[PDB]
Amino acid sequence: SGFRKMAFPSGKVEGCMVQVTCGTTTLNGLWLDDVVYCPRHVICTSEDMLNPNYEDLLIRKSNHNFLVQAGNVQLRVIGHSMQNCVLKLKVDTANPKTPKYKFVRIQPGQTFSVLACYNGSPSGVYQCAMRPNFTIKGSFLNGSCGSVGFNIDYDCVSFCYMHHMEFPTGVHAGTDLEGNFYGPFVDRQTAQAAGTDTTITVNVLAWLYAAVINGDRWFLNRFTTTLNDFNLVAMKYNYEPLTQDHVDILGPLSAQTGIAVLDMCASLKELLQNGMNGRTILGSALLEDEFTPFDVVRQCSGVTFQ
Amino acid sequence: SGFRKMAFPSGKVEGCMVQVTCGTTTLNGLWLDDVVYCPRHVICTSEDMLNPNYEDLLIRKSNHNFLVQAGNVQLRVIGHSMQNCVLKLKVDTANPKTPKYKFVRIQPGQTFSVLACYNGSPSGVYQCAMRPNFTIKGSFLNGSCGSVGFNIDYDCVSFCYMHHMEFPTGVHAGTDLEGNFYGPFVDRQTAQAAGTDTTITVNVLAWLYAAVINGDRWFLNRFTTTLNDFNLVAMKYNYEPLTQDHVDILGPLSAQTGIAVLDMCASLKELLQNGMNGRTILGSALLEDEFTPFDVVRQCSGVTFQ
Ligand SMILES: *C(=N)[C@H](C[C@@H]1CCNC1=O)NC(=O)[C@@H]1[C@@H]2[C@H](CN1C(=O)[C@@H](NC(=O)C(F)(F)F)C(C)(C)C)C2(C)C
Ligand SMILES: *C(=N)[C@H](C[C@@H]1CCNC1=O)NC(=O)[C@@H]1[C@@H]2[C@H](CN1C(=O)[C@@H](NC(=O)C(F)(F)F)C(C)(C)C)C2(C)C
């Protein structure tokens, strides 16, 4: 028992990080087979990033202008192209440590692990959620761009995020591995509007199930509710609507604990209307929404990866 | 910016995990050079663990009774010995992925990353603190024993923890890599007394500095205090005494932010006496004590590892 914020093991991704330098700008790249993927603003000077024309800047670059280093070994760049907001550098050497992998675009509310890197070297690993407003609350410093987010399925690494930028309130934004931004953002140093964020209801419910599995059961009440009535109450507290798809995804946790999803919704409704009365759930004094139903299952049932 | 619970990258440790089976009991082992380290209760049946005589049980085992698997490859055991609560299995093959490493015994209040494993395979990574009562609040299921805790310094893995047992309130206990337990515990399935836990004061202060570095500054007051006067107040709230050694360790964060350690102590004192008035610090509604001063520095300054 016990329940912690848990990341995927990072080793398979560690084997793919390199550093990419163009002129005087250095950031991280992801080396898979004979291609290195990295954020396109590696080609910018500081002045360029206030209003860059990326197509124009790349025109004046040739292959040899990109210094790619995998450890102390330089990887010769033999081609390059730009795909939305990422650059793809073809190199003369395939990465022998390339894992089985896919590029996926995750949905809001879904979680992933981030391997935060500087100069091509890993610094740490943490877990994040894609917020409903398509930001993430990460931890990133200068030089972190090209750090990736991922999930693991047995032996397959699903890469879902590459880091590009920080809005001055500690809110982070980036792209999938095809270079398309999550959310209505662009890779330019200028002020930009994000949507109001909301609470990921299905994840809160998953975490309440984790609490029950771990013996923290005080908030369970004797009532049920309808899905409509719960959603009306949750709207007022800036919670996302709970859909039948969400109810179906919660089925394994409901079956394991013997608590109907709508009964847990009745317990959450009381918590929203009355507060926690100074109490904690799984050590937290707030309702936690960055654990998915699968996160709870893989932690509480010990799923491993090859 | 941003501040998250961050683990060390786990790849170097992933390369060292194997599974160890003796009879019908299977758990994890740590394979370094030509030695596999694992908890000694791998030699027990379920009945044995209620009151085991480990020396007696090991007498009747020979090398061939230990099945060690590194992936799908069996490692031939060619010798064995027991060191306190860990077994050491000599194998005929040195692990080619052995990193630079040390075995260290950490002090209470110090943190480490745990790579939770089942059947020799990694499931996830999370960060833990050695509590003042020598327990940890981990997340561990059946088969997790032999999972290790560690810190990383550039390229050197400092192994500090191997997991052995859970007390029925989700409290975990284990040994250093010489098999000596942290705390007054033994590897027997019987009820055992742990000390009252306390709050790690120097870590709370480190986390308040992390808050200031990230722009969360509302709790800073205009007062200072003496070390004596602060410790008198913190005693009442079950906080560990703050020592001059602690004050010295906080120096880098104090210098970076320009807030004297005793001035931060004055701010913490007000928080203890008055509460947070419904407010959060770095997203938390409680004071957090599982970040060390070094944890804050390595996250907020982007220290990497080879
Ligand atoms: C990549 N190495 C960095 C990661 C940043 C650095 C500080 N925290 C992070 O996450 N990415 C950048 O520096 C990008 C990059 C130009 C400027 N930038 C920003 O993140 C800036 N933010 C924005 O411009 C805003 F607000 F629109 F998001 C900055 C003010 C420097 C934090 C480009 C090409 C967007
Ligand atoms: C190693 N694979 C497991 C890890 C346990 C399993 C559940 N959560 C964990 O952390 N270690 C054990 O099963 C050890 C082992 C016998 C029994 N045991 C326990 O952890 C038990 N706890 C205690 O006996 C207590 F309370 F004293 F800590 C159990 C009740 C099964 C949780 C031995 C040899 C101690």
Swiss-Prot record, chains A, B:
Documented effect of changing residue 132 to H: In strain: Omicron/BA.1, Omicron/BA.2, Omicron/BA.2.12.1, Omicron/BA.2.75, Omicron/BA.4, Omicron/BA.5, Omicron/BQ.1.1, Omicron/XBB.1.5, Omicron/EG.5.1
Superkingdom field: Viruses
Protein location: Host cytoplasm; Host Golgi apparatus; Host nucleus
Intervals, Cytoplasmic compartment: 1-306
Location in chain, cross-link Glycyl lysine isopeptide (Lys-Gly) (interchain with G-Cter in ubiquitin): 5, 90
Function as written in the Swiss-Prot or TrEMBL entry: Cleaves the C-terminus of replicase polyprotein at 11 sites. Recognizes substrates containing the core sequence [ILMVF]-Q-|-[SGACN]. Cleaves and inactivates human TRMT1, preventing tRNA guanine(26)-dimethylation of tRNAs. May cleave human NLRP1 in lung epithelial cells, thereby activating the NLRP1 inflammasome pathway. May cleave human GSDMD, triggering alternative GSDME-mediated epithelial cell death upon activation of the NLRP1 inflammasome, which may enhance the release interleukins 1B, 6, 16 and 18. Also able to bind an ADP-ribose-1''-phosphate (ADRP).
Peptidase C30 domain: residues covered: 1-306
Active-site residues, Swiss-Prot/TrEMBL: 41 (for 3cl-pro activity), 145 (for 3cl-pro activity)
Subunit comment: 3CL-PRO exists as monomer and homodimer. Only the homodimer shows catalytic activity. Interacts with host FBXO22; this interaction promotes the proteasomal degradation of nsp5.
Organism: Severe acute respiratory syndrome coronavirus 2 (2019-nCoV)
Listed name of the protein: 3C-like proteinase nsp5
Effect annotated for changing residue 145 to A: Complete loss of 3C-like proteinase nsp5 cleavage
Activity regulation info: Inhibited by pyridone-containing alpha-ketoamides compounds 13a and 13b. In turn, alpha-ketoamide 13b (tert-butyl (1-((S)-1-(((S)-4-(benzylamino)-3,4-dioxo-1-((S)-2-oxopyrrolidin-3-yl)butan-2-yl)amino)-3-cyclopropyl-1-oxopropan-2-yl)-2-oxo-1,2-dihydropyridin-3-yl)carbamate) inhibits SARS-CoV-2 replication in human lung cells. Inhibited ex vivo by michael acceptor inhibitor N3. Inhibited ex vivo by compound 11a and 11b.
Catalysed reaction, written as an equation: TSAVLQ-|-SGFRK-NH2 and SGVTFQ-|-GKFKK the two peptides corresponding to the two self-cleavage sites of the SARS 3C-like proteinase are the two most reactive peptide substrates. The enzyme exhibits a strong preference for substrates containing Gln at P1 position and Leu at P2 position
